[PDB]
Every structure is written in structure tokens, then in C-alpha cells.
Amino acid sequence: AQLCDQYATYTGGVYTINNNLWGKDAGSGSQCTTVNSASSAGTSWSTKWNWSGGENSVKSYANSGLTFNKKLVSQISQIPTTARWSYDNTGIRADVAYDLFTAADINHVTWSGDYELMIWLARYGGVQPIGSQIATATVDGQTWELWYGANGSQKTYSFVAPTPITSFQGDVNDFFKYLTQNHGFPASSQYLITLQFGTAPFTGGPATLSVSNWSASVQ
Ligand SMILES: OC[C@H]1O[C@@H](O[C@H]2[C@H](O)[C@@H](O)[C@H](O[C@H]3[C@H](O)[C@@H](O)[C@H](O[C@H]4[C@H](O)[C@@H](O)[C@H](O)O[C@@H]4CO)O[C@@H]3CO)O[C@@H]2CO)[C@H](O)[C@@H](O)[C@@H]1O
């Protein structure tokens, strides 16, 4: 599939790829997402974009998302994941990130949360998460800048890699554990509802993110 419309989507196995140009009215340009595979084991895809204007507004979050059995964060044992990706053009203002949502209501809309957990594998052009940097966190032996921000309904923790990580393998539950244990995250009353990986562009391009593999599961 070739996904160019705002909410063009394709599912295969437990992976759903969404072009997700949720911010397209904030600027001028286009974006198309290509799915290479999407099976029970993993997905491969790419997205090519060019955006101008609205320089402090995100245009899109094209992504692959996992279908999983929703549960309380405190009941999760592991969220193993691998991500391998690259950009052809890094002269851009954008980031590459895991995006997860949690809500007290297990039927909450899946494009937002009571809480959000992001893990930024890269940022370009100095773009930053919502809020402020509140800590340096060491998670599974690796250091992340930890940001916390809120817009009055959604509270968002962003872990940011000091240098880009183009080949990631880890357990996302280590980050929830860290939040639960160190920042009072309410794991025992929050359902994990969404688990995605993709890129959030502000300005630049043409530029293409190639995701050679993304895999995840929730146990
Ligand atoms: O998909 C259908 C649905 O989309 C709605 O729009 C959602 C997007 O789906 C979703 O991906 C997006 O998520 C944001 C999240 O809210 C941000 O917190 C997060 O971080 C931002 C940060 O908040 C900014 O300050 C900073 O500058 O950028 C970072 C990312 O760089 O980013 C994710 C991904 O962009 O939220 C959208 C809602 O705002 C539609 O609105 C809805 O109509 C559709 O049905």
C-alpha cells in the first residue's frame, strides 16, 4: 500500500500503518507512507514528506501501531520491541519516536491519553518534547533525558536519546517501571491503550524515514 491521504491506513497482522497527517492544516506540503510488509512478526515501511510553515507545530505522526490486549500498566511484565530505521536527509526539524498512551478508561480514544510515554530515538534541528527536562534517567543501563510536559488534559513523559539510536532493542516496560518507581506514575489504575513508532515532522524535506523493521509485543 501507498498511503497519501490524511488518515490513509493499512493493516496486516498485528500492525496498522497510518499516514496520520493530523497537523496538515498547520502548514504547506505533503506526505506519503509506503508499507513494505506487516505480518505477525514485524513491519517494514517508509514515509516521505515535505513540510513548510507552522514551524513550531507538528504536521503529522505517520506510524506503525501494535494491536495488543489492553491491560493495566501494573499488570504488564514486558513490552519487548525492536526498531531499525534511517533518514536519508537529516537537514530537517523532526523527531523519531515511540508513542504510547494510557488512560483510566480502557475505551479512551487511542490518539490521546491521560498520560503519554514517548521514547525519542532521534531529534533533528533542536526540536524538543512538550514541557521541560526534569531529570536524567538511566533505563536498562542507558541514559535518557527525561522531559515532562502537560497541556491540561494529557500528561506526557518523553525520554530523549542524547544521540540518535538507529537500531533500538529494549523493553518499554522498563520505562513505565522507571516512571512508576521514580515519578509516581499511577500504573495500577492506567490502561496501556496505544503503542506506536514513527516520526513527527515540523519543517523540512523532501525527507524519507525508512523503517526496515519494527516489532513489538505486550505481555
Ligand atoms: O489518528 C486519528 C486522530 O488523530 C488526532 O491527532 C492526534 C494524533 O493521532 C497523535 O499522533 C498526536 O500525538 C501527539 C501527542 O499529542 C504529542 O504530545 C506528542 O508530542 C509532541 C508534543 O506534544 C509537542 O509539543 C512537540 O512540539 O512535538 C511532540 C512530538 O514531536 O506527539 C504526538 C505525535 O505527534 O496527537 C494528535 C492530537 O493532537 C486527530 O486530531 C484526530 O482528529 C484523529 O481522529
Domain ranges of the chain: 1-219
Give the distance (Å) from ligand 1 centre to CA of residue 61. 7
Long-range CB pairs of 127-130 (<8 Å, 24+ gap) are: 127/93, 127/94, 127/95, 127/202, 129/156, 129/158, 129/160, 130/156, 130/158
Give the distance (Å) from ligand 1 centre to CA of residue 204. 19
**122/213 Cα distance (integer angstroms):** 16
The finding on whether 58 has its CB within 6 A of some atom of ligand 1 is yes
Kindly list the distances between the CA atom of residue 32 and the CA atoms of 7, 63, 67, 164, 204, in Å, as whole numbers in the listed order.
11, 11, 22, 24, 15
Superfamily of domain 1-219: Glycoside hydrolase family 11/12, catalytic domain (2.60.120.180)
The finding on whether 194 has its CB within 6 A of some atom of ligand 1 is no
Dihedral (Cα; 125, 43, 154, 80), 10-degree rounding: -100
Written as one letter, the residue type at 184 is: G
Nearest CA-CA partner of 97 in 187, 179, 175: 175
The finding on whether 209 has its CB within 6 A of some atom of ligand 1 is no
The finding on whether 130 has its CB within 6 A of some atom of ligand 1 is yes
Q: How was this structure determined?
A: X-ray
Burial pattern 135-174, b for ≥16 Cβ within 10 A else e, equals: eebebeeeebbbbbbeeeeebbbbbbbeebbeebebbbbe
